Symmetry: C2
Subunit: 169 residues, 2 copies
């Protein structure tokens, strides 16, 4: 579909800068795009569809805008860490959102990620695209970093499929 390819060219294509790496993942979901997007868009509640989140805190006066932040307490490695994340992009009409990890996540330094939600018709189904660019830690190989980031995104997208399909019922 052209809308898909246009989204990939605008939001999921990347420069191959040195010490950087990126990837793009896709998840078909048997649920309407509005439901999937209503979950995907809530920057303050990523635990609804992500794994390994002990908790996520936002300021007492939180309002979702570009530049708003969250603290994500992560327990996917056992000295728990607090990922500091910043909303880069939110467009409800285009169903696109994006965030950055500014600090607190030594495995994903200068992580930047974009998620887009697409409608497909035949029964109205959804395809979610999720991509990222991130530093390769100097001692790391690229494939280690991508393997880690890919594995996590794949599991989270599976959980998102599962929870939105249960919602749609």
């Amino acid at each position: 579909f052209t809308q898909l390819s246009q989204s990939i060219a605008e939001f999921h294509t990347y420069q191959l800068g040195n010490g950087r790496c990126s990837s793009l993942l896709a998840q078909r979901i048997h649920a309407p795009p509005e439901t999937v997007w209503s979950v995907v868009r809530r920057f303050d509640r990523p635990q609804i569809y992500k794994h390994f989140i002990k908790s996520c805190n936002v300021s007492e006066d939180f309002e979702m805008r570009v530049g708003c932040t969250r603290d994500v307490n992560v327990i996917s490695g056992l000295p728990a860490n607090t990922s500091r994340e910043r909303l880069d992009l939110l467009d409800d009409d285009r169903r696109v959102t994006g965030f950055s990890i500014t600090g607190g996540e030594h495995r994903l330094r200068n992580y930047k990620s974009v998620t887009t939600v697409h409608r497909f018709e035949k029964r109205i189904w959804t395809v979610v695209l999720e991509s990222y660019v991130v530093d390769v830690p100097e001692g790391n190989s690229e494939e280690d970093t991508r393997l880690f980031a890919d594995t996590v995104i794949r599991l989270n997208l599976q959980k998102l499929a599962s929870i939105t399909e249960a919602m749609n019922r």
Copy 2:
């Protein structure tokens, strides 16, 4: 079952001295217990149903009974490091297997795991029980440790369910 409770008593109960924690998880599978066991028993190939395994290698003269070892490279996001895991127990008649993590930096300390697979009716279904005991060093959090381990095991058990249910459908 009586068999289920006895297997729990024998293999999934632990003593509670602090600096150690334990947990039991259950997974229900709509597949025959011999199929599930045929998968679970494969000590040399945990990549079949476990997440976060980049690779797993065994000696060229490998033979699988108690005391043999496997080398697993874990997808942790940290620099690549090989871990050594040891087959603690294996009974094909009782459908019980178990292993210990004996080596590996930035891994869990003294992690010990046991998996039993149980027949059930009331078309044949299966319950898989998996438990672990693991260290919690005086600086670490037991809450976080159980969150981490339980999430991993629950994901692995879901993949095992999916894979064994795909077999012969």
